[PDB]
Amino acid sequence: SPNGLLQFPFPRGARWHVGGAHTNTGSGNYPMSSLDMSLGGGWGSNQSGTWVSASAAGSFKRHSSCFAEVVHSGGWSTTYYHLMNIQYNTGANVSMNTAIANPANTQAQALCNGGSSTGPHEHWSLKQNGSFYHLNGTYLSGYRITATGSSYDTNCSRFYLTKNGQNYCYGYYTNPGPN
Ligand SMILES: [Cl-]
Ligand SMILES: [Zn+2]
């Protein structure tokens, strides 16, 4: 995703935790399409005010009660997994920063289509032409992503976000919007 196309998939102005890039399944080192993002709280916590947000405007796909996709321009799409309280149905037009769901606050709901999770979060992925895309060299909220390690690697020489020449390791990020 080129610089300016996508914002972080959480509210503009909010400050959420961003983990290391990983493949969709969490094993291997390619394509590292995915990032886990959360605000806080474990299983059972109140996530009803924690709003997973559309990375860009596009067309909504509600795959299940825990899994959504937004189809953007240019063959790009973003996907959002481990959800509850999805706010749109398939075919809806959503905007950049539209609140689309909460992170599922129970494991059974978070894993409604399989997988594993240690706690409430969104598993966000970038796709191009319907295939998982490798995040190295892509942009998110104006940060250039470097991802050259294995899944979930947070070593700050192999996973970091770069903006205005400064590198930033994994951790909490305030969402400025797409730039
Ligand atoms: Cl709708
Ligand atoms: Zn994940």
- In total, the number of strands is 16
Task: Please report the number of helical segments.
Answer: 1
Radius of gyration computed on alpha carbons? 15 Å
* Strand content bin: 35-45%
Q: Which ligands accompany this protein?
A: chloride ion, zinc ion
Q: Helix/strand/pairing class, anyone?
A: mainly beta
- Kindly state the percentage of residues in helix: under 10%
Shape: globular
| Largest sheet entry | 9 strands, antiparallel
* First-last Cα distance: 13 Å
Query: Helix-strand pattern, N to C?
Result: EEEEEEEEEHEEEEEEE
Count up the domains: 1
Explain what the structure shows.
The PDB classes it as hydrolase. Keywords: elastase, peptidoglycan, hydrolase, Beta-lytic protease, antimicrobial activity, Lysobacter, Metalloprotease. It forms a monomeric assembly. The entry is titled "Beta-Lytic Protease from Lysobacter capsici". The protein is Peptidase M23. By secondary structure, the protein is mostly beta strands. The chain has one domain (1-179). It is built from one helix and 16 strands. The protein has one helix at residues 107-110, and strands at 15-18, 34-38, 52-53, 58-64, 67-71, 76-81, 83-84, 93-94, 99-103, 122-128, 131-132, 139-140, 143-147, 159-163, 166-168, 171-174. Strands 1, 2, 4, 5, 6, 8, 10, 11 and 16 form a nine-stranded antiparallel β-sheet that branches. Strands 12-13-14-15 form a four-stranded antiparallel β-sheet, with no helix packed on it. A three-stranded antiparallel β-sheet has the order 3-9-7, with no helix packed on it. A hairpin with a 2-residue loop joins strand 12 (139-140) and strand 13 (143-147). The chain is globular and about 40 Å long. Bound molecules: chloride ion and zinc ion. Chloride ion is lined by residues 88-89, 92. Residues 22, 34, 36, 123 line the site of zinc ion.
